[PDB]
Symmetry: D2
Subunit: 240 residues, 4 copies
C-alpha cells in the first residue's frame, strides 16, 4: 500500500529532488507551495511506480501560520501522511544592523513558525494510529545552524530553532512510532544563493552540492526505523 | 575608571534578578527591563551601589511587542550607552505539542526569540562602531532543553535553540566589531518557570534545583572575559552530559 | 548504457567477521564491492566470506587474519591479502566494549580496549591514507569509522569505552578536513545499543530511549551503505541510536 | 577557612602555571606535577600564599609513564588529599598523518589520554567514597581542535577528543558521589601549540593568540562552581563558533 508523504517547498530545487525520490520509492507525494503553475509542472514529472500511488498539489502560502496549522487547502487530511518533509525555506543574507524587519520576521515565520504549526497539525492527526513502520518527520535545516557564519544571524536562528524542535519532538513522539530528524544541507546549487557561494568558504570538499544528494539523505531516513533526534549534515565538510 | 552600563531583560525576578545584583556588585550601571513596574522598582531598590558614578535604572518593556523592543520605546538610556546586554527574558510552557494552544506558544516564541532579535539589533546598530579598550558583551540565557531534547517542551526548546543559533552567527559577525556573544544555558532553577517539574523527573548527575545565583556566576565570568565568544556555558547539573 | 570493463571496488572492513562488521561486509558485497574482512578469528571470517554475495564480474572477497590488538601489524599491513593501495573504501569497525566503574576497571583490560579501539585504527588509517592519498579519482574514497553514541552522551561505567570512540570522532573530523581535497571523504556512523556489540551489563532498558529495544546490526550497515554511495558527506557522525543522543 | 589540596599536571609551564597561580591566589594548596624539576621549584616559589596553613608541593613526574601516574609514584601526597585535580598534561604535534612518525603520535597518545586516565582512575579510587560539603572537581584541559576538524592535527585532535568522551562519561558516573567533571577547551594559546599552526590560519571571530591567564580563569570559575559537570568551557576566540 502506497504511503502518503507531505513535502513542503516541493516546487523547486531540494524539495523537487526530494519529492521525485519519494515518488520513485512508491510514495504518494503532496507538494505544497505558493507557485501553482510550478507545482503542476513538477506533479507530472513525479514517477508513478506503484499501483494506487497518486500525487497531489497543495497551493499553500508558507507564511500563513493559521492556514498551515488548519491544513487550509490540503487535498488530503493530516491523518493521511506517513511522512512529512518540512523543506519550507527562505534565506536572507544581511548584517544584523542592516537587516530589514519585514524580511527577517517573514523569514522567521516561513522557516519556523509555519513549520511548527504544520507539524502540530500532522502530529495531532497521526499520533494514535497503528503502524509497523515508524512514520517520519524530517526537517530540512542548514549547515549554518550549527557553525556560525557572519551575516546569516536570523537565518541560522530560524533553523537552529528547527533543530531544537526536532530534538524535543523526537523524544516526545518516539514512543508513538514517529521518528523525527533534520537533514542539514550546506551550500546547494539552487535559488538560495544570490551573493553567497562555496568559494567564500574553505570547504574540505570544493564546489556546490547538488539537490539530489540532499534527497538521498531524506530517502535513507524515510527508509530507516532506528534514527531519531539526529541531523544528517550534507555540507561538503562545512561543519567538520 | 568608569561605571559601564548593562542592560538585562527579565531583571525583575529569578535568574535576571540574580544576574542584575551580581552585575551591580561588580559596579555595572544596570538597567532592568520587564513588564511589571512595581516588581522593577523593588529590584532597583535592592541593586547594590559600590562605586561613585554607578546608577541603576528601570525600563518598563512588554517583552511581546517587537516594534517596542526594536525601537527602544521607554528606554532610560540610549542604546549606545550599553557595554553589556544580557537577554534573559523567557517564557516556559510544558505541553504535548498536540494540545499546545496556538496563542501560548506563538507568544512564547515572540518573547523568547523574535523580540530579543529586534532588541539585539537595536543594541548592535548602536554599539558596533564604538571604540572600547575591552570587548562588549551580548549574553543570552538559553536553556538545557535547547541542546538535549525533552518531551512536551518542543516549541520552548525551539525558541531557545533558535537563540543559540542567532548567537553563533552574531559571535562570528561581531567578533571584529569588538563584541563577544555567548549563551548561558541554565537547567532547572528555583523560580516560577513552568511548574510541576521537579529535578526528580530527570536522572541528574547532581540532584536538586539550581540556585539562580549560580547562573549569574556564569554571566559575571563571561562579562569579565575577552577571548570567549560563540560558546554556551552549561550550568545544568549535568543534564546535557 | 553498457561497458566492456566496469570495475569492482575494494572495501576493507576491520571487525567484519560478526555483528555490525558482518552486516556491513554483506551489504557492501551485495552493492558490488570486493570485500576484505579482517579480524582475529579465521573460522568466523571464512564463515562470513562464503555468505558474501557475488553479483558482479571481477568481484572476489578476501580474508585477513589480523590481531587488532597489534599496532605494528595494523600499521604494516602484515598478512594482508592485498596492499593498502587497493582499497577505495575503508571501514574501521574494530572495537571492544567494557563496563566497570572507572575505579574497579582492570588496567590491562581498559588499556587493551584503547589500543583496539583507537591506537591500532590510527595506525591502520595512516597506512591507507599514505597508500591512496595521491592516487587519482573522480569519485571520492571513503574512510568510515564505526563509533558509538556513548562518545557524544556520557553514561556511567563506560568511561574508557567512550574516550576511545570519542578519540575516533576527533580523529575523523581532523582527517575529513585534512584529506577532503585529496578526494577522501571521512565519517563516523555512531551505533546506539545493538545486539552482541555491548554484552556484560549494559542494555537499552537502562535508558529512556525514544525507541525502546536493541538495534539490528543491519541498521548500522544501512548508514554505511548510504555514506559509501555519497559524495558530499564528510566530517560527520551518522547516529543510529534509537534516539539516545537526542 | 581550610586550604583544600589541588593536583595540576603540566603545572610548570604556560597554561599549567597560570592555572596553578590562580588556584593558589584563591587559597588552594597546590601540587604541580611535571618532569622538569627546576621549573617546579621556580613556580612553587612564585605560588601566592593567602590562607592560614596553605602549603604548595611538587611532584616530579614523567607524564608518559602510565604505571607511575597510576600508582602516584614519587608524589608528595596520597591521592586521598586532593579535592581538585586539573589534568593539563599535554603535548601537541603538527604533521600530515601520512608523515606522522609512529613513535611520536603514540607518545602523544600516552601523555594526552592514557596517562591522565590512569591518573584520573587513581584520584577517583581514593576520593570516591569520602565524605564532602562542596563537590570535588576533576577538570581536564582539552583543545578546540577536539570538536572542530583542522588538517595536520589528526592524533592531537583525537587524543583530546578522548579526554572529552572520558569526562562526559565520568560526569554521569561520579556526579552522585559529589565529583564534578568538566573540560576547559583552549583555542590557540601562547606557547602551548606546536610551531607550524597559528591563529592567522582561521577566521577567528577574535584575532590573535590567547593568554594562558584566560584559560586559568575558566578553571578558577569551574573550581568555585557547584552545579556544572559534563561540560566543555571554550576559551577559543570563537574557533568553534
Amino acid at each position: 500500500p502506497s504511503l502518503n508523504a507531505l513535502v513542503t517547498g516541493g516546487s523547486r530545487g531540494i524539495g523537487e529532488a526530494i519529492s521525485m525520490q519519494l515518488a520513485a520509492e512508491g510514495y504518494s507525494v503532496t507538494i505544497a507551495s505558493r507557485g501553482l503553475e510550478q507545482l503542476e509542472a513538477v506533479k507530472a514529472k513525479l514517477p508513478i511506480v506503484k499501483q494506487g500511488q497518486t500525487h497531489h498539489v497543495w497551493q499553500l502560502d508558507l507564511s500563513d501560520v493559521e492556514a498551515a496549522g488548519s491544513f487550509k487547502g490540503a487535498p488530503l487530511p493530516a491523518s493521511s501522511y506517513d511522512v512529512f518533509v518540512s523543506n519550507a525555506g527562505i534565506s536572507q543574507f544581511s548584517p544584523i544592523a542592516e537587516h530589514a524587519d519585514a524580511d527577517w520576521q517573514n523569514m522567521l515565520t516561513v522557516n519556523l513558525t509555519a513549520p511548527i504549526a504544520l507539524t502540530k497539525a500532522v502530529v495531532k492527526a497521526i499520533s494514535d494510529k497503528p503502524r509497523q513502520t515508524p512514520a517520519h518527520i524530517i526537517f530540512i535545516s542548514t549547515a549554518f545552524s550549527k557553525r556560525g557564519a557572519p551575516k546569516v544571524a536570523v537565518y541560522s536562528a530560524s533553523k537552529a530553532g528547527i533543530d531544537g524542535f526536532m530534538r524535543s519532538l523526537a523524544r516526545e513522539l518516539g514512543p508513538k512510532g514517529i521518528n523525527v530528524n533534520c537533514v542539514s544541507p550546506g551550500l546547494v546549487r539552487t535559488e538560495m544563493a544570490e551573493g553567497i557561494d562555496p568559494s567564500m568558504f574553505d570547504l574540505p570538499i570544493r564546489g556546490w552540492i547538488e539537490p539530489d544528494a540532499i534527497a538521498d539523505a531524506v530517502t535513507y531516513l524515510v527508509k530507516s526505523k532506528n534514527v531519531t533526534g539526529t541531523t544528517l549534515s550534507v555540507d561538503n565538510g562545512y561543519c567538520a
